[PDB]
Design a binder for this molecule. Sequence first.
Ligand SMILES: [Mg+2]
Ligand SMILES: [Zn+2]
Ligand SMILES: [Zn+2]
Ligand SMILES: [Zn+2]
Lengths: 61, 170, 123, 134, 575, 107, 205, 166, 75, 227
Amino acid sequence: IARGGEWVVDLLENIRFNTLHIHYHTMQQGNNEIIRGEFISQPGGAFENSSQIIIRYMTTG
Amino acid sequence: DPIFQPVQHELNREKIIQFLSEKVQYLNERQLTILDKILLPHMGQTADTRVRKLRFLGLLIHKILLVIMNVFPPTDRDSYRTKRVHGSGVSLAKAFKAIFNTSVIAPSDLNRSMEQSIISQSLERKNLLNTISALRTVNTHQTERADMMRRVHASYPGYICVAQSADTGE
Amino acid sequence: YAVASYGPTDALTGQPLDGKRSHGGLRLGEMEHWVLTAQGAMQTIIEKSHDDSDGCISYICRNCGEPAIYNASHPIYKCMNCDVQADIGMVDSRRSSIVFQHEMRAANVNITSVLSPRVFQPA
Amino acid sequence: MIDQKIFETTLNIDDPTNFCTNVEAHLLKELENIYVGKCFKNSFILNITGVIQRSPCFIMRTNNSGRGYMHVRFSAVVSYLNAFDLIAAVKIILGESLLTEPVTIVIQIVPVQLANSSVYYIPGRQQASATGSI
Amino acid sequence: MEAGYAEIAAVQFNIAGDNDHKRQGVMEVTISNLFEGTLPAEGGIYDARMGTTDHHYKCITCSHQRKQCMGHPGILQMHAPVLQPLFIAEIRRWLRVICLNCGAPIVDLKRYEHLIRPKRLIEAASSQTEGKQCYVCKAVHPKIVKDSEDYFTFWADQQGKIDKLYPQIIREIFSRVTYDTVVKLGRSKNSHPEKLVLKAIQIPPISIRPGIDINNVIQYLVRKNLLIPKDLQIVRGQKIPLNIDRNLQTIQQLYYNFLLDSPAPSIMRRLPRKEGRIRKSLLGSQVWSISRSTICGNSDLHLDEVGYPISFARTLQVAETVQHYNINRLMPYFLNGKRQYPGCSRVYKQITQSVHDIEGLKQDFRLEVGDILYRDVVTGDVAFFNRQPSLERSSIGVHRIVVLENPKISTFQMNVSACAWYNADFDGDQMNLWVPWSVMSRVEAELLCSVRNWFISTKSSGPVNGQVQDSTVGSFLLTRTNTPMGKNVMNKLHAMGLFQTTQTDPPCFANYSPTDLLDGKSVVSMLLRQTPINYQRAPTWYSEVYAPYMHYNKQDISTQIRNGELIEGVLDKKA
Amino acid sequence: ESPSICEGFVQASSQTLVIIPDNERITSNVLTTFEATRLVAVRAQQLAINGSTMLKKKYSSPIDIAKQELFNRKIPLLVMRCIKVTPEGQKIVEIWNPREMGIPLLD
Amino acid sequence: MAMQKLFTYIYEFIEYRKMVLLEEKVPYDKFVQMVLNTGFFRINAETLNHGIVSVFIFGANGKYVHHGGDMRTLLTNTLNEKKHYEELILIVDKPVLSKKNILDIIVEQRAANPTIVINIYPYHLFCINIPKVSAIPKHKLITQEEAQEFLGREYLQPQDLMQISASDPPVVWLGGRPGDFVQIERPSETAMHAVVIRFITKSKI
Amino acid sequence: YCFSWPYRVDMNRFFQFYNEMPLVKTIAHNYVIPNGLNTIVAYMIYGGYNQEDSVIVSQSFIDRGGFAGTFYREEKVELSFGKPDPLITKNLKPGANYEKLVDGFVPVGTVVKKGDIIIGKVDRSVMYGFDEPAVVDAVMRPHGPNDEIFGLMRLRYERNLNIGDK
Amino acid sequence: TSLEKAGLNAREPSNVLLRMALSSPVQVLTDAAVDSAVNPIYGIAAPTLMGSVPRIGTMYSDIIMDEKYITENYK
Amino acid sequence: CIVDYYRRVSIDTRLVQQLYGEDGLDARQLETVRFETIMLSDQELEDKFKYTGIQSPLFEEEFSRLKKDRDKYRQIFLNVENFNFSQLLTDVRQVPVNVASIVKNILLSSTSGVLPFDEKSILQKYAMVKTFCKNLPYVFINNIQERLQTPIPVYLKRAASLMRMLIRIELATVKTLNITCEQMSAILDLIRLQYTQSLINYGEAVGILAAQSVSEPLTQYMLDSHH
Ligand SMILES: [Mg+2]
Ligand SMILES: [Zn+2]
Ligand SMILES: [Zn+2]
Ligand SMILES: [Zn+2]
């Protein structure tokens, strides 16, 4: 209840943490690279700060 | 590497750390001390977890290379094995965490701004069904991606209703 | 919803407001204009987009192509560019178009309206 | 001095059915009503006598009013002035000339010689504006 | 004096310089003060000479009141020149193509002469032009670089030595350029590069900035312009003090953000996108005298009729000018007023040029010839019926109004066969309806946009309308040879009863006894005889997939019509 | 300093209306639905401002008067079809008399 | 391949152009050998106006299509011969058309001789009887008198017409110069054939 | 929609008087209150009035309370409350009733129309505006978050099933 | 030529208002100013952006009053 | 793209089409009819359309005109068939006027039945269909230029080719034996009236019509993407 109205905090669909998400950017945009394995690291619980690391293979190799 | 030309061949670790610091012995440690906290914190944030951090990073690179070798497909972006649903408790705490430092630590505004975040869904009381479905709704926030995320994924059955969705509009 | 020929207008464009909530409006968008154009109406479009919308009368000098200052009631007949040679002509327009031309001029793009020539049958 | 100058204009015809019953008479009536005694195109236009060319009574296209306009090239006698020109009688109201050329000059009856500033024929006004000396 | 009718035949686009702003402006912004209590400050950015945003005062310039006043531009004489935000790339192109010391072109004007004029300067500036020696003054052309952290500053690099090209320096450089270099580089005389640096900017008319967020940027610009010294001169290599280096930067940034930002949306961001001035305000329009409601079916309405609820019929009005030929017809409307239907609620008296509400007419019963009466919508009026999205040519059609005098009905009612024009159904669809009130628009609606003109599809050249659902299956049941009860016959009473609601002149049954039996094909032929046509085709009923099973009646599987006499076959989707 | 664009702008050469002779006209002798609709609309608006008609029959609506005037070939209007605007200032038009033209179906 | 088709259809092009050969036809083996040796094969034909049209067929690997100096030498030498020289046609590989230096020498010598028409075309322009291709409607050049009367009746300037390139294959086979008018009899699925007139504009490349 | 509907002040909330358990119920109705009615429906062609997803409804079924209910709208304005005096005159809303006002508010149980004035404020009054007439049954004066009074007038709409209702 | 922005530049380069109405009005307007473009008022989008009405079907043909007929019938 | 006074389609003044549909017809005014002569062999064409009642060179000329029209149709639409993937030649065409129906209606309304042999009428009936087909392209201009018999532009001659071909098939002497000269003059006036009523109006925004007409099938094409 706020400002005289009724509000709900929706369930947000979120990417699982501490997992590698390998992505193929296959439609050739960003042609200088097609792969990226994203990893977001959660230290000890959903409240801690998460650090995202991105590992790429480039066309250069 | 056009950006890391000088240290591409360097074995002097201190030189690497120094060049990283300028791109971003006490200063040598600090830039290395900040690194392990921001690089795979879930493995640990102390100097005794560097070996396992490196092993895990090698494993991640190995998995990406396995995918590039067509040994494995790319991770399914719509499968629910790799998804999580967050509501109320998680969503407010992260917003409270961001709001706590800027309103308390940085210097009645935190209450107002938290409420403003709450407003920025409205509980529609069409019926009891509308209420308990609005609280049972999971929200995701012209390409193949747009097609694929709207489909009935094969991981849905039993967790996401295979029928319930909007019938009109985006 | 049903609205009569009057109500709240937008301050900038002079058009009606947005629908029932604002107590005025309802929209004939791009596609409606395409349909009326394909039907070749052009007098329904005059009525709906000028008489029932932000229709207005503009004054162009015909000697410089620039908007002029004309007033029938308070006698005013002048243009800032070629004052003594003003040849002001009465051009039907819309306030949205006048605002658009003013916005173009505010970006230092000069807009001169050539105006169709006067045609005379041979003496 | 009095001279003749050819002007062009577009009239507006609020009753195109009645106007076309006698185009020349109504046309001269409207031209005299609008332009006689008013500065227009750097001249005063004392009176209108003569229509050289005219257009058909076109019906206005961009509005649903049903009105017409007509373009007119008419020949009119105009009063024009030059620098260092003499005016016989200027009445004090700032001075207003009593002759057939209505000029209000900024300096009983005093004769006036015009200055070199040239006469301002502000279009639409019932007189000219000028400066001079005695 | 009279402003004659004119039409815009062409629009000429150009770059506006200082002379344009000085000539067009009706005032100069000299003060940063906003209001003089209640009236706008004279010399402020709200000065009434620019126009009026309120009903409390007129324009001074044109003496109109907020509606006939289109607004008038003002001038802001800047103490230091500014670069026009739109033409920054043009300034950059002209900088590297012109010698800075004397204004002569450093490039060879013959080399690009053959190119098309819009490309001549682009390609001339494409060349490196660094280190080139001027022929006239033997000066080495510096390197013209762009500061990466803003959009409007130019640096001249002389082999490692760099000096910032201030707008006064650039103005002098471009003033040294002759018109011959301008025309030989493909630009018009009106595109001389000296126009690209403004010392007097145009203050927009208040018409485009009404309400008391864009005026904040104008206000900040005006006061910040006062900070700069009026006699500030900047020669090349002056090394001006830093206190005004920031101040000069913030004026140029304010002017740039005033026009090309993206807070306080700029002038040029009002144009693009779907919500911009062009697509929302110009190419579309919000209109008056229009209604919207849910549509629903009414089988008793003709295909070119629309059911208009009476509440909307009194809201929307038709303007009728009173003359001798319509005065008697318009009197019942005038006497009914708002109390009775068909009534009227407005009167415009042309002698007073004023509109009078029908309730306030003390003795105005003299509805005199020449005044305009706004009367309610009556049955038989034409109305535009539109469903969105308007994709087809028939998405807007004109229907004859049938006013539904039942006060409980609030839907737009239409025949189900008219839905094909709008691709509409009755599951919650809404359509817009507006009744033309002008004579010109009504003549047009009746003669041109009537839905009889969209019966044949423009897209496919075939018919759009026909029987749907119940009438498709009801035509088959009517015209089939046999029923489960035996032959598909009806007696004279039921044959007559089929024509009760056709709203056409009923046929003659006087040759039939009460016990005489009539086939469904016989009663259909009684109707088709009014428009005799010849048709011979197999029905949708007969199909080869069904044929191996089911007993197909021979009389049913070949639909033949000769001069409107249906003699065999059924009527279904095919027919 | 560049001059104002208004200074170097010349408005337009006034045109002369060249009317193609009646035997040289190549446009249709039948009114289009657009031209017939426009003629009826103009006539009906002018009957809203004026009231003088040549119709013997009396009608209570300007639209009906205009429609019958078009059908009965006494509409006091002409159709001018501008076919060319010549660079040396000639407006070449065909003027068609709707009373002599073929009326489209319109119904 | 391209060479035999070009050899058989360049003479069909010359005949379709209503041109008579000044020289005599050589066997195909002699033609390909001359292309391989000299780098080009030159065919000279005479028009009805006794003008000379020279056709040059450049091999893919010849010296001329690679170095602009030899192209300059050849063009300057042939253009100085004592011939009327109505036109010069140079047939090369399509990739040569994207070589900037060859285009530069072509346009330079075109400017050097304003009277002579110099044109450079790919092989596929003459590897088929273009007028006999089913998908190509019948093109024909119309005189300036027919075009003038058509434009006068239609109150049109030549610039109002639909445009066609002088390098269009049917226009090349017709020999249509820019500024000329070509009438096309196009098949129609609504009118069962139709006629348009297209204004010939400047050649591409 | 909410079992505490009369205590609550709601906007665009419809309370339907009569609800029925479905004759053919499902497991869902063990957890959500059934809303709707077990209407008798004939799947038939009747005059072509139910074509293209239209329905013919019994007028008596509407009159008897079928799908009837109350629709509620909230009017909240914030600051003095009171009927304007004739001294104001010029600033008064054009053609507004300004009557039917007691102690600055419309009394509970009064049928208000488009021209009526609800919650007089000082001109700063509030025009009803809606085309559909309403009945006022609520007049509160609660204090806002800064302990400041406001209007909070609740309007009641009696809604039977209409032609054009889905 | 295409139906995209580039096709409209090839077919109607001088119709700035039409090209502004399609997309990117600021880019088109800047090019028109530097090019000193003259936009003849024709078609549909250009007269609409100028607040006028397109000169198509009912506005395609000009109506002129029949003076000869009026003086002989209406005088 | 707007239809001008020549029924060309132009942008401002620059032509897009010499005639709007290449035939200058509104899309709402077309009927699909069959051309009988298309599939007939040479022998069965004679059996059906070669008149034998009168031994005159005119009826030899009438049949050659029929044979040439059939060959022209075949030559055009076999070529159209060639430069397409699967666009088969069809004997059915969309025409402004269904001549076969007009003849049938006139025959029905005729009080007389089988007319007796009248050589003067049959020769004169043939003459005024030959004259009518010759003057057919004047529907695209006006009756003033028809009266003066001024030249028809070539593109306007081609615009009437399909209707001239149908009139010859449907008003062939074998098909109008029972039709009087007064009836045939009424037939021809009815054909010309429906041809005039089928033409595209000046000032029609046919570019918007095409964009609207082609965009709707695009949506169905995208629906059938899964197919
Ligand atoms: Mg629907
Ligand atoms: Zn001027
Ligand atoms: Zn003003
Ligand atoms: Zn120099």
